[PDB]
Design a protein around this ligand. Structure first.
Ligand code: HEM
Ligand SMILES: COc1ccc(/C=C/C(=O)O)cc1
Ligand SMILES: [Cl-]
Length: 393
């Protein structure tokens, strides 16, 4: 009773324009079977939300990529947070929640906002820039490694490592093979910086190690928790901020509404996360036979959740293909939902808000003025190059 589809959601053709295929995935049924990779798929909001919020049935400890850790060796030691179920997940989650807490945002906000304002003013002196390399990448590179407390040496490995991280959740296609092959130098750099002596006191990494005193994590758990932030904390925000600028460039009416009320910056970024869904997909693995939308899925099956499709499902969203900075976005699954919901969401929103605030106060127009190039990744959606001309307000 389950429709079988041949759509490859990790193919370059799909990445290049996923929306027609996502509708076919939604409209085929609440649950589909993807013959290309032998996994189940859910693409509607209701089922994606249900799977995310049913962690005892749809577990994370067998991996959140295609690979089943019960069957294949993980490419690196399993994540203590992303690839753990409760109760093992709980205390590492609590540490990260405290390290990336509301109280912590107060300590970094002035620096993050200052860097965003300075970057936009710098770009306005150049006129014609690449909104990826010069903005979406440059700005997070200017604040997040420092907030982590990383040394200067080796930071050139951060974006390559993240590309590997997010390609590795995918199937064994060319993107994944090429990423994992000869990835040892990227892994070695990151694993070295996770050690306590290499992390600046006061930064996120040192604060993680400081929590080993409390009994919430052991000293040998702290480097892997630092690793989780170096895996997820940079490339996500690159594609989130790039998504927002791409939206503002394509919807000039919405840039003008943002200009008229810069306090819409935070929601304008949140809507960009829904609209583009920089993190497109994650998997779960069934721990038991389970009925889901009329489908009876066996134990030990991989289930692919299309977060971006859920965020564009007209069953849930009015006018889902419209970028609307005053939309009530609560309930979107671009940061996940439930026990694994993005623990770094305050850092992501802070970066996005202060950058969009700077644009709102300083920029009158954003015009695409060069060839746009898409960046292909098994998990991340975003652009490789976005040439724009910025007109000062
Ligand atoms: C626009 C930016 C971001 C997006 C769209 C995003 C997306 C997501 C999603 C969808 C999940 C859920 C994973 C799952 O359910 O399996 C997640 C979890 C996570 N994210 Fe974020 N993320 C972003 C930024 C960040 C930042 C800035 C950090 C760290 C500074 C971070 C660190 C993490 C970690 C450690 C987890 C694992 C949480 C857990 O398993 O409990 N992410 N993210
Ligand atoms: C939202 O994407 C991600 C990606 C990776 C991770 C953790 C990685 C690790 O523990 O090494 C967490 C979230
Ligand atoms: Cl690693």
């Amino acid at each position: 009773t389950i429709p079988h589809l041949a759509i490859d959601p990790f193919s370059l053709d799909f990445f290049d324009d996923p929306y027609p295929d996502q509708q076919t995935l939604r409209d085929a049924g609440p649950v589909v079977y993807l013959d290309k990779w032998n996994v189940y798929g859910v693409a509607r909001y209701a089922e994606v939300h249900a799977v995310l919020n049913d962690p005892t049935t749809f577990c994370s400890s067998r991996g959140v990529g295609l690979s089943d850790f019960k069957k294949e060796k993980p490419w690196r030691p399993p994540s203590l947070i992303l690839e753990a179920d409760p109760p093992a997940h709980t205390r590492p989650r609590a540490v990260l929640s405290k390290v990336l807490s509301p109280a912590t945002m107060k300590t970094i906000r002035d620096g993050f906002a200052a860097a965003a304002d300075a970057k936009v003013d710098e770009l306005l002196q150049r006129g014609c820039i690449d909104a990826i390399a010069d903005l979406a990448e440059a700005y997070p590179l200017s604040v997040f490694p420092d907030a982590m407390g990383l040394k200067q040496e080796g930071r050139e490995h951060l974006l390559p490592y993240a590309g590997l991280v997010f390609n590795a959740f995918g199937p064994p296609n060319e993107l994944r093979q090429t990423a994992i092959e000869r990835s040892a130098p990227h892994q070695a750099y990151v694993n070295e910086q996770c050690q306590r002596p290499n992390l600046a006191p006061g930064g996120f990494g040192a604060c993680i190690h400081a929590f080993t005193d409390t009994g919430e994590i052991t000293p040998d758990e702290a480097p892997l928790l630092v690793r989780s932030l170096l895996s997820a904390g940079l490339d996500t925000t690159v594609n989130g901020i790039g998504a927002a600028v791409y939206c503002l460039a394509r919807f000039p009416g919405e840039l003008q509404r943002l200009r008229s009320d810069p306090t819409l910056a935070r929601n304008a970024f949140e809507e960009a996360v829904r609209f583009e869904s920089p993190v497109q997909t994650f998997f779960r693995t069934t721990t038991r036979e389970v009925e889901l939308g009329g489908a009876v899925i066996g134990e030990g099956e991989k289930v692919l959740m299309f977060l971006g499709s859920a965020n564009r499902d007209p069953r849930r969203w009015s006018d889902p293909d419209l970028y609307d900075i005053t939309r009530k976005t609560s309930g979107h699954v671009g940061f996940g939902s439930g026990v694994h919901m993005c623990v770094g969401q305050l850092v992501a929103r802070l970066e996005g808000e202060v950058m969009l605030s700077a644009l709102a106060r300083k920029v009158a127009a954003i015009d695409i003025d060069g060839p746009v190039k898409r960046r292909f990744n098994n998990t991340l959606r975003g652009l490789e190059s976005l040439p724009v001309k910025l007109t000062p307000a």
